[PDB]
């Protein structure tokens, strides 16, 4: 929070959910 405030921004968190999502498209959606 105080020592490294660069990560205190929204798009970083947007980037991280997004990744969990897209990677979770690994399971073949339709076979």
């Amino acid at each position: 929070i105080l020592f490294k405030p660069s990560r205190n921004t929204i798009e970083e968190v947007r980037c991280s959910t997004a990744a969990h999502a897209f990677k979770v498209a690994a399971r073949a959606t339709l076979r």
């Binding site: 498209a25 959606t29 339709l30």
Partner: protein, 219 residues
């Protein structure tokens, strides 16, 4: 004892149907003319003027895609029906930069941009994501040595009059949006590009997770 039995049976069946209809989703394929709608639909339907809906059978969710481009009438008068739709699968063709239209001597790119701006600008579509499929990439990649866009377009002062770069048209479409815009999911496809249904599920999961995370207030 007719009335009570009939009412009870009808209510029970209706409640059972409503409970069973909990898992469903709707999306609209709003695209311009000559965008290869049938060609795009056939690839995903093979495996993995009326309003026709395609009942996709994805995992644990029955997706429903509705064709709405073929109407040829006013759009605002019936666009109110689709309000619970969670995404817009808007479609364009990249070969319209030099494919001039004279049937009005204005290129179809201007019409596509106007349609995109009209659809996005709608205040009703505020809690729905936007998917921007770009098709027919092969033509743009191949035929650019005789179709430089320095004159046909005013914002392509690039290297010279080869080495196609689709990012310019990407930027042109992206800039036509208000500030604080939601993430626009755009993956360039081709005639036989199989990896599209899984791009769609990716945006759907992301479109929902972001929303619920907003609702439970976890941010």
């Amino acid at each position: 004892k007719a009335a009570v039995e009939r009412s009870k049976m009808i209510d029970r069946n209706l409640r059972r149907d409503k409970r069973d209809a909990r898992r469903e989703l709707k999306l609209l394929l709003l695209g311009t003319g000559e965008s290869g709608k049938s060609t795009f639909i056939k690839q995903m339907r093979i495996i993995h003027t009326g309003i026709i809906e395609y009942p996709f059978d994805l995992q644990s969710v029955i997706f429903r895609m509705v064709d709405v481009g073929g109407q040829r009438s006013e759009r605002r008068k019936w666009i109110h029906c689709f309000e619970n739709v969670t995404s817009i699968m808007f479609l364009v063709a990249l070969s319209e930069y030099d494919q001039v239209l004279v049937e009005d001597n204005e290129n179809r790119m201007e019409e596509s941009k106007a349609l995109f701006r009209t659809i996005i600008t709608y205040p009703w579509f505020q809690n729905s994501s936007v998917i921007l499929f770009l098709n027919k990439k092969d033509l743009l990649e191949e035929k650019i040595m005789y179709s430089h866009l320095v004159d046909y377009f005013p914002e392509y002062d690039g290297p010279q009059r080869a080495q196609a770069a689709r990012e310019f048209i990407l930027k042109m479409f992206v800039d036509l949006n208000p500030d604080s815009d939601k993430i626009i999911y755009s993956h360039f496809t081709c005639a036989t590009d199989t990896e599209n249904i899984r791009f769609v599920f990716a945006a759907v999961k992301d479109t929902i997770l972001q929303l619920n995370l907003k609702e439970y207030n976890l941010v």
